[PDB]
């Protein structure tokens, strides 16, 4: 929703990392200048860039694990529930299927009814911990 | 086991980060010297340290999520299976309990028998992805 504040917070971060990265690349090159005025430096620059480049590669984020998404909704599950076949779906989606499509396990075809659905408490914790450590979500 | 190779691989990393970190702190201070020879630099040093300090704070690792551990084994689950009450245990541990302790859900006390155990396929994927992205495990 109005959670566009995550972009603002990371805006201030990205901004500082860029300033630090430029500053550091300046000191380096300048040193290379002084040295080649009287290289190993070129290597320090690569690793130095890679360091900031990596802490930016993971910033690409948007990588919502597929194993945290429903088989029906194809997206992060809010209420993960498992069937007796061991397949986890998002409650709203599965209860939708069992009421609109039919009384069968979307994947195993095994006979199924809403009352057999079991709350996957463990998965709910995994997803919650995921949504916390990853504000870009939602 | 002999997977002590993870310590060797990260040994080479940690070693390079330290060398880069020292080198960078040298260029900085030297610059501060030249400036204070004719500070904002002190701030660049803090953030620069924090940068390497952070990529080391997470290296503390050993943080095996509790929600990935069994209620009985109290440790990373190899074969996560859920009960009809929605509680996930490691197979070996739960089947041990149902055969040595009694036919009841360790936490909900609800009546239980090995044949009711359901394989928590979703959790198995979560843990597998965890063991991969974290070699220090095992
Ligand atoms: Cl789903
Ligand atoms: Cl357990």
UniProtKB/TrEMBL annotation, chains A, B:
Localization of this protein: Cytoplasm; Mitochondrion; Nucleus
Domain named U-box: residues: 63-137
Domain of life: Eukaryota
Protein name (database record): E3 ubiquitin-protein ligase CHIP
Organism, as annotated: Danio rerio (Zebrafish)
Gene name in the database record: stub1
Part of the whole protein covered: 127 to 282 of 284
């Amino acid at each position: 929703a109005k959670k566009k504040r995550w972009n603002s917070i990371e805006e201030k971060r990205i901004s500082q990392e860029n300033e630090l990265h430029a500053y550091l690349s300046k000191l380096i090159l300048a040193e290379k200048e002084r040295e080649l005025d009287d290289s190993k430096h070129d290597k320090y620059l690569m690793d130095m860039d890679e360091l900031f480049s990596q802490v930016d590669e993971k910033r690409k984020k948007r990588e919502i694990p597929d194993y945290l998404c429903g088989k029906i909704s194809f997206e992060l599950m809010r209420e993960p529930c498992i069937t007796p076949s061991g397949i986890t779906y998002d409650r709203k989606d599965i209860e939708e299927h069992l009421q609109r499509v039919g009384h069968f396990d979307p994947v195993t075809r095994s006979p199924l009814t809403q009352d057999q659905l079991i709350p996957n408490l463990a998965m709910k914790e995994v997803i919650d911990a995921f949504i916390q450590e990853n504000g870009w979500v939602e």
